[PDB]
Design an enzyme around this catalytic site. Structure first.
Site, PDB file in Angstrom:
ATOM      1  N   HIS A   1       2.948  11.124   7.010  1.00 38.59           N
ATOM      2  CA  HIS A   1       2.195  11.005   8.309  1.00 38.59           C
ATOM      3  C   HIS A   1       3.045  10.454   9.099  1.00 38.59           C
ATOM      4  O   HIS A   1       3.672   8.993   9.145  1.00 38.59           O
ATOM      5  CB  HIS A   1       1.114   9.738   7.839  1.00 38.59           C
TER       6      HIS A   1
ATOM      7  N   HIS B   1       0.704  -1.077  -0.050  1.00 37.89           N
ATOM      8  CA  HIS B   1      -0.073  -0.223   0.001  1.00 37.89           C
ATOM      9  C   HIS B   1       0.897   1.280   0.141  1.00 37.89           C
ATOM     10  O   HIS B   1       0.467   2.184  -0.758  1.00 37.89           O
ATOM     11  CB  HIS B   1      -0.966   0.039   1.207  1.00 37.89           C
TER      12      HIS B   1
ATOM     13  N   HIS C   1       1.614   9.228   1.464  1.00 35.68           N
ATOM     14  CA  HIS C   1       0.584   9.126   0.465  1.00 35.68           C
ATOM     15  C   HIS C   1       1.345   9.970  -0.818  1.00 35.68           C
ATOM     16  O   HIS C   1       1.441  10.977  -0.514  1.00 35.68           O
ATOM     17  CB  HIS C   1      -0.692   9.234   0.928  1.00 35.68           C
TER      18      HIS C   1
ATOM     19  N   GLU D   1      -3.507  13.839   0.960  1.00 36.63           N
ATOM     20  CA  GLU D   1      -4.848  13.253   1.588  1.00 36.63           C
ATOM     21  C   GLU D   1      -5.750  14.370   2.049  1.00 36.63           C
ATOM     22  O   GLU D   1      -6.895  14.706   1.501  1.00 36.63           O
ATOM     23  CB  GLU D   1      -4.413  12.203   2.410  1.00 36.63           C
TER      24      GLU D   1
ATOM     25  N   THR E   1      -6.329   6.878   7.712  1.00 38.80           N
ATOM     26  CA  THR E   1      -6.845   7.024   6.317  1.00 38.80           C
ATOM     27  C   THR E   1      -6.767   5.761   5.285  1.00 38.80           C
ATOM     28  O   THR E   1      -7.176   5.679   4.115  1.00 38.80           O
ATOM     29  CB  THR E   1      -6.261   7.969   5.376  1.00 38.80           C
TER      30      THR E   1
ATOM     31  N   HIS F   1       5.137   7.077   6.975  1.00 34.79           N
ATOM     32  CA  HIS F   1       4.571   6.582   5.691  1.00 34.79           C
ATOM     33  C   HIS F   1       4.486   8.010   4.933  1.00 34.79           C
ATOM     34  O   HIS F   1       4.084   8.767   5.589  1.00 34.79           O
ATOM     35  CB  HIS F   1       3.910   5.563   5.742  1.00 34.79           C
TER      36      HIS F   1
END
Ligand code: BEW
Ligand code: ZN
EC number: 4.2.1.1
Length: 256
Positions: A116, A61, A93, A103, A195, A91
């Site tokens: 994050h 992911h 996104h 996000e 999230t 991590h």
């Protein structure tokens, strides 16, 4: 089998995770003209001097940089928070294109990526217990824009080739997360959720106003990661972001 495609992406998650349609889901759009300054907020304290990173993992992911959270070595305190929150992992996104990836959004603006830094409330003893509590986690969110390179990110960039596919990990000791922070700690805060599935409503969000800059070569290396496992057809790890969710009965507060 959740993910970020047509057939298993965010609009599908609610079937396995009904809390996806809950009252405190993340991310959200931060309307800067609705968020109110809160003089009751105490100074934010990011104490990462003794952080001990251990490993980096491609989990199919994103990638997680993992920390030793067996003691108070890297903690977040202050701001909206009561008590001490221990860093467990960070991590990102990110997008397929520089115009998307974050996000949270700021007046509907999407950044190229979002970091994050995940912390759990030590009053609950472990992460697994913390995520079952409405004040169990504190996630420090930091926007990435494309410009100049971030020196402090390069050690991350240069290990990604060793964890290209799902399930791969690499030793990642002596990484200093202080080098991922912007100059200012001015933030917005609101109550929300993870999230990603399981989308648990356990997070105090602290989203920094000042983005960090990374270079296009840096984010291009993020985009070379794979969602798939080794030996499988390649699906580039891009657009691993959930869009903004309804704010519902929530208040976003500004520290500034
Ligand atoms: O995406 N994510 C995964 C784990 C914990 C927090 C968050 S935001
Ligand atoms: Zn996240």
């Amino acid at each position: 089998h959740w993910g970020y495609g047509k057939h298993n992406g965010p609009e599908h998650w609610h079937k396995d995770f009904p809390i996806a349609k809950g009252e405190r889901q993340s991310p959200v759009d931060i309307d800067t003209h609705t968020a109110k300054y809160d003089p009751s907020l105490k100074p934010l304290s990011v104490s990462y001097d003794q952080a001990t990173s251990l490993r980096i993992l491609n989990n199919g992911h994103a990638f997680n940089v993992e920390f030793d959270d067996s003691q108070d070595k890297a903690v977040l305190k202050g701001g909206p928070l009561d008590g001490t929150y221990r860093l467990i992992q960070f991590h990102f996104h990110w997008g397929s294109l520089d115009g998307q990836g974050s996000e949270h959004t700021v007046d509907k603006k999407k950044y190229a990526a979002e970091l994050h830094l995940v912390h759990w409330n030590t009053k609950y003893g472990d992460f697994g217990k913390a995520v079952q509590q409405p004040d169990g986690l504190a996630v420090l969110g930091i926007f990435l824009k494309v410009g100049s390179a971030k020196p402090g990110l390069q050690k991350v960039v240069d290990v990604l080739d060793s964890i290209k596919t799902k399930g791969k990990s690499a030793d990642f000791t002596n990484f200093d997360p202080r080098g991922l922070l912007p100059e200012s700690l001015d933030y917005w805060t609101y109550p929300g959720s993870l999230t990603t599935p399981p989308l648990l409503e356990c997070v105090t969000w602290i989203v920094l106003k000042e983005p960090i800059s990374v270079s296009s070569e840096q984010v291009l290396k993020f985009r070379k990661l794979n969602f798939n496992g080794e030996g499988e057809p390649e699906e580039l790890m891009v657009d691993n972001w959930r869009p903004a969710q309804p704010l519902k009965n929530r208040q976003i507060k500004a520290s500034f």
